[PDB]
Design a protein around this ligand. Structure first.
Ligand SMILES: *[C@@H]1O[C@H](CO)[C@@H](O[C@@H]2O[C@H](CO)[C@@H](O[C@@H]3O[C@H](CO)[C@@H](O)[C@H](O)[C@@H]3O)[C@H](O)[C@H]2NC(C)=O)[C@H](O)[C@H]1NC(C)=O
Length: 261
């Protein structure tokens, strides 16, 4: 059990911001996308003939269980084709949990809605570099060893405004067992004194992208944890220093009236 604390996992961010315990309709949830996630599940339960209590419970469960975005793979867990087709074939940011009446894993599909999910902004010092090392921190709430981590990044064509995170849009960037280490004084992970930190070589992007983290138990039941992490690089402004030779308003209104429609 656990979640990504850096860059913060999408579901962990929603849980941390709170406001979802009351009113039951999700109206005190401050972030528009977290509120939409909650309301999606809440309205899905009501549409299936559930009571307001059942609907609030299902939507709250999705936020409360931010450390249990899990799926059971069974003994074939090492085979990514088995994972892709039978374990987490859909609703990747929910780790495939789409049954509000059955807990675990409930229905966490609100977290897989498409839209302007707020990303972690990673500033670049150089815009021409194609691999940016990120020290990812994963915050375990239970120590389940032996296990291993896989990290994927969305392909360059992925568009967060349009596309679901799906396996044909993901590329493997990291695959390793990772040691449990003491958290630093600046962590982030308040839930545990120890964390898993790993250097992930993130490919450059000029678009908002998703980092998809998989923590898989090396075990016969094959429980694995899956988290979507929203991120974007901020390109450094100004001219390319290598181009540079050394020395020896009604326009917005206009734009609005003359585009589209
Ligand atoms: C991440 O790295 C691990 C470790 O290298 C990869 O694990 C390897 O996964 C394959 C399955 O895709 C295993 O192969 C299978 O081996 C059995 C023999 O026991 C055989 O019957 C199957 O036909 C198949 O060849 C392989 O054993 C396993 N290696 C270890 C050390 O467990 C894993 O696949 C990598 N993940 C990704 C997404 O590539």
């Amino acid at each position: 059990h656990g979640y990504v604390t850096f860059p913060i996992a999408r579901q962990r961010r929603c849980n941390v911001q709170g406001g979802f315990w009351w009113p039951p309709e999700g109206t005190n949830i401050p972030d528009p996308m977290c509120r939409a996630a909650y309301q999606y599940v809440f309205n899905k339960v009501l549409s299936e003939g559930g009571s307001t209590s059942q609907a609030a419970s299902a939507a709250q469960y999705m936020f409360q269980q931010d450390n249990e975005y899990a799926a059971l793979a069974g003994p074939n867990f090492r085979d990514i084709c088995w994972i892709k087709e039978q374990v987490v074939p859909d609703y990747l940011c929910a780790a495939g949990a789409d049954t509000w009446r059955i807990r675990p894993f409930g229905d966490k599909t609100g977290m897989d809605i498409v839209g302007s999910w707020p990303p972690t902004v990673i500033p670049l010092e150089n815009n021409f570099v194609n691999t940016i090392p990120i020290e990812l921190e994963f915050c375990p709430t239970a120590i389940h060893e032996p296990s291993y981590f896989e990290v994927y990044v969305t392909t360059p064509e992925f568009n967060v405004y349009r596309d679901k995170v799906t396996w044909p849009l993901l590329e493997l960037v990291f695959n390793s067992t990772v040691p449990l280490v003491n958290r630093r004084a600046d962590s982030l992970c308040t839930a545990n004194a120890r964390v898993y930190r790993m250097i992930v070589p993130v490919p450059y992007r000029q678009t908002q992208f998703v980092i998809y983290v998989r923590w898989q138990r090396i075990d016969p039941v094959g429980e694995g944890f899956y988290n979507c992490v929203d991120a974007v690089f901020a390109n450094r402004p100004g001219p390319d220093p290598e181009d540079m030779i050394p020395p020896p308003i009604a326009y917005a209104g206009y734009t609005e009236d003359h585009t589209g429609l």
